[PDB]
């Protein structure tokens, strides 16, 4: 049933997730999230293949060469939330 929940807000999604937790539906949560993932959006997202692609993109951007990058290396909250290989590589770059 849950996958059909008419979520819109952030809270709606968090509710869904909370129910996936409460019932232990990691495959469901993984799917819901997959639906959410589908530049800023990509940054927010940062399955294995996708992560690899994101890594490659980051590398390309670095070779070509802001807040997100600093966080990887309001702000405190972001650092707390952040607290993977692709990410580490981008941070190194």
């Amino acid at each position, epitope marked *: 049933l849950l996958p059909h929940y008419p979520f819109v*807000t*952030n*809270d709606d999604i*968090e509710w869904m997730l909370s129910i996936c937790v409460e019932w232990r539906l990691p495959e469901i949560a993984k799917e819901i999230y997959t639906t959410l993932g589908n530049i*800023e959006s990509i940054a927010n997202f940062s399955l294995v293949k996708s992560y690899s692609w994101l890594l490659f993109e980051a590398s390309c951007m670095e070779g070509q060469k*802001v*807040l997100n990058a600093i966080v990887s290396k*309001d702000d*405190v*909250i972001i650092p*707390q*939330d952040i607290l993977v290989t692709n990410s580490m590589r981008q941070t190194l770059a």
Partner: antibody, heavy 114, light 104 residues
């Protein structure tokens, strides 16, 4: 979705007021609550914010040491305790949230005088 | 503390006119800039976030753009209901506001 602000009004200078902002329709626990004030005929002034996630708080220079922002995630309610109030603090006070500032309090008027 | 300077502080424009309000950051902020509309006697209402993202439900005549440290709020076709003070925002700081009136 709605922020609610109560507890302003008339207050003697040097006095004190606790403002409440009761939230609903959103995740208080991962939001940031800000207080922004507007003095008669003037622009908006951000005074304080709190992270409900980390409990981190911060303040504009103009209110530091006199104003305390706090938050109770378990009743989805945030607070601004205003001590040693001054004529300079007379203003409509708005609570607002971030997950920019998408959700705004209807505002409550604080008038400070003797 | 960061200062946000709006130009002009006041303007008059006819219905159907295109209106441009600019905001210049004291130092270099990043696209972390929002635009609001405030009617007198009421809470500000979010218009634009992240410099150029249109907040949900807001009429498409409102748009935001960035050129370096200059931020632009544009109203493509001014409506009579659009009179207000508009504010940019990046401590969090607000611009001083731009008052928009209808010319007759």
């Amino acid at each position: 979705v709605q922020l609610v602000e109560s507890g302003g009004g008339l207050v003697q200078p040097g006095g004190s007021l606790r403002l409440s902002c009761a939230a609903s329709g959103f995740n208080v626990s991962y939001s940031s609550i800000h207080w922004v004030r507007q003095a008669p005929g003037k622009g908006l002034e951000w005074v304080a914010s709190i992270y409900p996630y980390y409990g981190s708080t911060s303040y504009a220079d103009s209110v530091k040491g006199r104003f305390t922002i706090s938050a109770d995630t378990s009743k989805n309610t945030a607070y601004l305790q205003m001590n040693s109030l001054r004529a300079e603090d007379t203003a409509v006070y708005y609570c607002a949230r971030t997950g920019a500032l998408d959700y705004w309090g209807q505002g409550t008027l604080v008038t400070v005088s003797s | 503390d960061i200062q946000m300077t709006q130009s002009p502080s006041s303007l008059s424009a006819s219905v159907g006119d295109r209106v441009t309000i600019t905001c210049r950051a004291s130092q270099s902020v990043s696209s972390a800039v929002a635009w609001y509309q405030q009617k007198p006697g009421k809470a500000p209402k979010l218009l634009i976030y992240s410099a150029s993202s249109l907040y949900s439900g807001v009429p498409s005549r409102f748009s935001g753009s960035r050129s370096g440290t200059d931020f632009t709020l544009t109203i493509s076709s001014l409506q009579p209901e659009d009179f207000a003070t508009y504010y940019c925002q990046q401590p969090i700081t607000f611009g001083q506001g731009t008052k928009v009136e209808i010319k007759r």
